[PDB]
Every structure is written in structure tokens, then in C-alpha cells.
């Protein structure tokens, strides 16, 4: 999906 990308990406902030 297109969410978890920033999802993912979160954890990386």
C-alpha cells in the first residue's frame, strides 16, 4: 500500500 510507506518510514524519523 501507499501508507506504509510513511509508516515505515516513521520508525526512521
Not at 500500500?1 to 524519523?13: A, M, P, S
Amino acid at each position: 500500500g501507499l501508507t506504509w510507506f510513511i509508516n515505515k518510514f516513521r520508525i526512521v524519523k
